Amino acid sequence: QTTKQFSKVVEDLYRYVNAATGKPAPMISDDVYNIVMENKDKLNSAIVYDRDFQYSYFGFKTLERSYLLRINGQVAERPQHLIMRVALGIHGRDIEAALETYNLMSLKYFTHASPTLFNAGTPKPQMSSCFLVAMKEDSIEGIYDTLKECALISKTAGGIGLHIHNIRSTGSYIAGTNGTSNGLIPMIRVFNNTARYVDGAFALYLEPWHADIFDFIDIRKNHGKEEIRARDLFPALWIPDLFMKRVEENGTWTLFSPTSAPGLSDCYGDEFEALYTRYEKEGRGKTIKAQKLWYSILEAQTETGTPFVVYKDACNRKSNQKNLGVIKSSNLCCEIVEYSAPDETAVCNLASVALPAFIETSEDGKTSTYNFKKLHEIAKVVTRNLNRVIDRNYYPVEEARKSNMRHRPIALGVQGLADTFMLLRLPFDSEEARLLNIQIFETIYHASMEASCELAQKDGPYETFQGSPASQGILQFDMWDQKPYGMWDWDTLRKDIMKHGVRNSLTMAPMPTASTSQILGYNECFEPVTSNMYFQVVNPYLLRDLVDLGIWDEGMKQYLITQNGSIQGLPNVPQELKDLYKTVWEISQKTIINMAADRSVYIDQSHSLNLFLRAPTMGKLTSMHFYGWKKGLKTGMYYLRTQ
Amino acid sequence: QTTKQFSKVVEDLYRYVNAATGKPAPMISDDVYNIVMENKDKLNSAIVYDRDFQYSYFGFKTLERSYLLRINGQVAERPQHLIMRVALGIHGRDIEAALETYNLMSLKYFTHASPTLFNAGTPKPQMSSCFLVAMKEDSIEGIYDTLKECALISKTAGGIGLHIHNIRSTGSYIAGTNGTSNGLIPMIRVFNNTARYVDGAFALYLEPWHADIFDFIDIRKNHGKEEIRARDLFPALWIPDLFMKRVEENGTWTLFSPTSAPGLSDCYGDEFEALYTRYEKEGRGKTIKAQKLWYSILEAQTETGTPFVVYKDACNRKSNQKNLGVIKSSNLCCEIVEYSAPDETAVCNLASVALPAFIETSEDGKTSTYNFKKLHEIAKVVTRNLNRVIDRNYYPVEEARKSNMRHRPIALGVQGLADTFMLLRLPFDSEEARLLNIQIFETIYHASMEASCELAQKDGPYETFQGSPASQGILQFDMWDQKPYGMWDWDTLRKDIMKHGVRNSLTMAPMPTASTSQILGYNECFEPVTSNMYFQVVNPYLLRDLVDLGIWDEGMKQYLITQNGSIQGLPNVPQELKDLYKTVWEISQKTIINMAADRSVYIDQSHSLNLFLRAPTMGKLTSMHFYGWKKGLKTGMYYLRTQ
Ligand SMILES: Nc1ncnc2c1ncn2[C@@H]1O[C@H](COP(=O)(O)OP(=O)(O)NP(=O)(O)O)[C@@H](O)[C@H]1O
Ligand SMILES: Nc1ncnc2c1ncn2[C@@H]1O[C@H](COP(=O)(O)OP(=O)(O)NP(=O)(O)O)[C@@H](O)[C@H]1O
Ligand SMILES: Nc1ccn([C@@H]2O[C@H](COP(=O)(O)OP(=O)(O)O)[C@@H](O)[C@H]2O)c(=O)n1
Ligand SMILES: Nc1ccn([C@@H]2O[C@H](COP(=O)(O)OP(=O)(O)O)[C@@H](O)[C@H]2O)c(=O)n1
Ligand SMILES: [Mg+2]
């Protein structure tokens, strides 16, 4: 069904011709083709085809349906071919690095994000997952320039975070007409329609003092007038601390059109508060009860899972990019926290480490341990990969090229945190899981900064490194005013960074891993399992245990189907198992938030913290938000899932 | 209720401040303000306020509701003030010309189009009614650049004609993806949505060999899937002669994607036919029965009044702009026929002559005659006005400035043709009406070319005059291979044009006059009355006659209400009256088309020929189209009205 020889497969993909039009349509770049032909024997003999069976049925089907390159509707690539295409696409002439990446990916130590898997080694290799776009100007020309830019980015793969704080609100004056602005909603409908035309995937960012806020937060509601909804876009709130204070005090909140109150989004913290309370005192806006807004926000979150919540002041106070300017948005999945401006669209290239790969029974007596030294080594590899992607990437718009080449941010993440705890017999809410969580993120952050510092000794630091927190020896945990756990030597690293610089302004942004975790067969990313039963497949670790204890029968299976993936209150199942295989609906969200806060001291950017509320009340949701906020989180909430 | 002194009114408008924001919002330009202050006594004393009563109730209300400038929701301008503001807005420092235009407009000899009436004398004086826009390129970038340009033009006043022949059709290949084009309809929905956002008014032009044609023609249907309709846009067909021949032969017709059949819209006539039949023979497209398309077109016209029909080869063969390139569209109302390209958006400034103004009882014995010499003199005035507008206009986009300054087209038109015939006791379908129609259009065309030639002796000819038909002594009627009626001396004019040039590439484009004819109180533009009764106002001329004959009673009035504006088959009304006051539903469309064809030999551009079909059949509509087509018409049909 598929040619075996890799160079033979490369040849077919490269020579490919669209029969219907007679147009040659190479699916491999000149570059990678010439590389493969000059090295065919080394390359062909390196692939271990046994490794195609490291995938599950649903992992293979995921690859088959979307990832493996097709010739005339037929799969042309084997999984091993996809992986070697990616390796060369990243590494180019560096055959050695390519070979190392081939071996580590093929053994499932790590993977790159979907767009890298799609486009690495191909003629327009757009490998970035994330674009953060500034609304160019409060004008028809700026709106339409911004729209063109989103269209062109959406032509390729990857999401958009778009901030729109600078657009004048409903009823605002326009110079040259007697008519007024119709505000955000009509303009959002324009963007919605472009998202649909160019083959969703836009998040919109707004600060809650904007006067169109009440409609903005309701944009995904499945009822009401069809011309007030924008159903393919996601609203995200970019929330100042002052809003949270006014809500908690049960105080007032003032809504402005940005034309009546200029500059509010171009400052944060104390400067924001001073500027805000001054405009408030000067009668420039419309005052409400803060809790009236607060309540409408919880209503929309309860109904639609949105708006997302990202804390503006936490993002800005604790960003290594703070020498660039004020950060005005996150991205589609709320992990990326990078500077953007009309001339600079922040981009990011993504990869995730497979956490269970580092478990070894290695020891005396059948206990599993965690190999942190190997985690550290693989994270260095991935860091070097992501840095290469930056240089070999095709940028859809010039604003993205200019941003990426200047600041060189990258984003490492994880999958299989849940599997890891499960394999080590650690309940997600245990003291041992809490510790392992901190140690894992300490080592990945240590490793990435070390790799990046080595790159800066080879190539120079990134352009804007001088003046950064990192240039002053201030690493992420220091900006949380915490000492690191200290499994790695931070003083020596900080010494080296201050002397040599780093090659990347940012390194860590744990992402959802929605498709890539399915390819590898692990749970997802720092999140607990959502059920133990996802045509019905039972949690392999749970299955193993129930068989070993000799309790697994049809009576067991039904009790799992019927309680949808929960094993609690199953009569004859040991407590150790119930503790180990708690669903995310069964774990306290204060625990989830605690662990998010623990790991966040080692996270440069942010992370996509989904929240899961069993029996949701306004009161429970409020206390979750205020708890995350006071913990110092950047991303208070990504999606709210309920039921 | 209104200040009397004009300079006092100018002062208020100029000093105006938006109270709600504290922004100064002048409603008069620096230029006109400084002009008015330096000439206040001459200016104030020239206005004759008696003349505000030359308007009807519904004419005044038209002015009041939309035209007269407002200060804080209150009318600040008197009709005489609006007219003098317009006069200075056109003429500037030329106080004499201003005064002449004031007198002629205030006495209702002529008027300018709405945007001139809105914006003349104001800070952003966008006075043009018509923009013809080329789709920039078959790419996401070109589509979105075009969209931005339409948005910016629509911010101001005036319609868009947009040609889209160059966009690849549904299912076409895209290089760099496995997916295909979704064609025109999705892209049309993008434009529809922008039209709604920026405060309809777009016509779309397509040649009927495009493979998306069947959906394109159905875009205004009031049923079917909401995502195949574009309800605020108007489809217009840009029809090659070959299509009409294939339909009449009951032959085949081939549909192409422009990417499979390049160049089809960049040629016409014989070159088009040769290129087309070659692509047809080479299997590059999909063949159908021509009459299958023909039938779907009549169905859409019957249901929706659209698509408009404009004959591509007639427009190109008979255009003075033919040295520029191939013309690919008309405009929103199908009167403008001008060259457009990605870097040149054709524009046009419009004015209409009030035809009844030139009727004088002057004579021996109470007969009315028509003063052609005075018509000729007023048309020269209007021609000079329109040329000044070109230079004092604020262009919304650079593409429009570049086109207008190069070719300098203008568009004179008419209103009150119906009133004129009625006042002279000439039935619309009579031999005398047929003659007067030809003589009126002969004099307006003679007058405009004479004024324009005088301008070229003062300022030089327009930039692209060399190589034009007019430069070779070929005037419009010559391109119809007809001798002029000869009430004016054409040889001397043609001699002068060949020697001196003309200042304007085009001069005549009779337009709908939808609002301006209401302001003046006349019927419309070369069209018969649609009824004799339009809160119920009876045709003043008919009323006068029925009173004079002593037959006008409540029994008369009811018979008019009840037959909706028709006097035919009213028992006791003289035949002379029935002949004189035929409704447009009562006049043969072969007569309408004959008169359109007669006048067209003196029309540089085209004219907005609405058609009215009483009891419509596929057969009647077909023969109307083929009759106009064979007559050599450019605009075969604007709207189809029925019932
Ligand atoms: N015709 C329109 N329809 C809808 N919104 C408009 C329109 N014109 C302007 N706006 C909105 O008002 C804002 C200003 O648009 P812009 O193109 O800068 O107008 P302008 O003529 O320059 N007047 P101003 O910006 O007040 O000096 C943007 O947020 C637009 O979306
Ligand atoms: N992602 C998309 N969604 C919808 N239409 C598209 C998309 N990409 C291209 N098109 C359409 O296909 C045409 C070509 O678009 P363009 O941006 O030039 O694509 P391209 O990548 O340059 N490929 P090609 O034009 O075939 O060389 C235009 O008519 C577009 O509307
Ligand atoms: N449906 C999606 C999911 C993610 N993304 C982008 O990809 C990034 C990472 O999401 P992910 O980890 O779920 O993506 P995969 O690489 O696993 O497909 C996000 O931050 C988005 O910018 C997208 O464009 N569309
Ligand atoms: N509703 C309309 C009508 C006309 N127009 C433009 O104005 C031109 C002349 O139409 P018209 O003679 O009915 O306009 P008025 O000047 O009488 O308002 C058309 O060719 C269009 O380009 C428009 O933009 N919107
Ligand atoms: Mg502006």
Ligand SMILES: [Mg+2]
């Ligand atoms: Mg292209």
